[PDB]
């Protein structure tokens, strides 16, 4: 039934709104300057970073920035976890499988949602209270600079798809419920949940993007691309805490990356 598929899409969207403070709609309302509340503080260099410390936080710089990305990711993992628990059937899955789905899915989701806060010139940080330029981040000394850039590279391509929060809510759910993650114990229940979410995504895209028949197929490929994107991320990261003495990694992040073959 198509009616139930729309009810599901709406349920996911509502849960998405409850789990993620800054939505793509609100992000772009700020990015384009259509909002009335205080625009974000722009950080484009060492000097500006220093000045905006109080407006974003409630080689020491490159490391300082890296640390910021770590704290945001930790927060993001928790927000995504709350979202996952709202997907029908998820909390009833074997608990270790839930852990596995999150372990291999969080970073792909982080990349996806990160795009919502980015444009070609920069990224919104601190719930939209700050804006750090892409060129400033890309200029960070090795190997940090090449750690930031790929996220923008992906975002530019992904945002060309013009998905909205309603599209994204289902897209993210589909990714989390991937029955082929390494080490899953009970595959079938996960595959059945995903099959239904995929049908929900297909209908959502057909109705919401009537003039772009290729969208569903492209998102499926994007899901495959995200895995390759995440592997490269994990590598470049394991070389930082491998070539930077002064580099501590948050426990939660160490857990996710550990044994992430």
């Amino acid at each position: 039934e198509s009616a139930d598929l729309r009810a599901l899409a709406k349920h996911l969207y509502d849960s998405y709104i409850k789990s993620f403070p800054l939505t793509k709609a609100k992000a772009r309302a700020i990015l384009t300057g259509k909002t009335t509340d205080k625009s974000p503080f722009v950080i484009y260099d060492m000097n500006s970073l220093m000045m905006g410390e109080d407006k974003i936080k409630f080689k020491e710089v490159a490391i300082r920035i890296f640390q910021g990305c770590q704290f945001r990711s930790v927060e993001a993992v928790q927000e995504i976890t709350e979202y996952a628990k709202s997907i029908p059937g998820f909390v009833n899955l074997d608990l270790n499988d839930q852990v596995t789905l999150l372990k291999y899915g969080v970073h792909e989701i982080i990349y996806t949602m990160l795009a919502s806060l980015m444009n070609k010139d920069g990224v919104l940080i601190s719930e939209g209270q700050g804006f750090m330029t892409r060129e400033f981040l890309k200029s960070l000394r090795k190997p940090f600079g090449d750690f930031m850039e790929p996220k923008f590279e992906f975002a530019v391509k992904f945002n060309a798809l013009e998905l909205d929060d309603s599209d994204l809510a289902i897209f993210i759910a589909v990714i989390i419920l991937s029955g082929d993650r390494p080490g899953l114990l009970n595959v079938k229940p996960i595959e059945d949940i995903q099959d239904n979410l995929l049908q929900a995504l297909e209908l959502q895209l057909k109705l919401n993007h009537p003039e772009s028949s290729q969208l569903f197929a492209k998102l499926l490929q994007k899901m495959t691309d995200l895995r390759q994107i995440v592997t490269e991320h994990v590598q470049l990261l394991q070389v930082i805490k491998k070539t930077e003495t002064d580099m501590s990694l948050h426990p939660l992040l160490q857990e996710i990356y550990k044994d992430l073959y």
Partner: peptide, 11 residues
């Protein structure tokens, strides 16, 4: 993965 475990069970 006890941390992910804990987050999955709270709330």
């Amino acid at each position: 993965h006890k941390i992910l475990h804990r987050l999955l069970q709270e709330g």
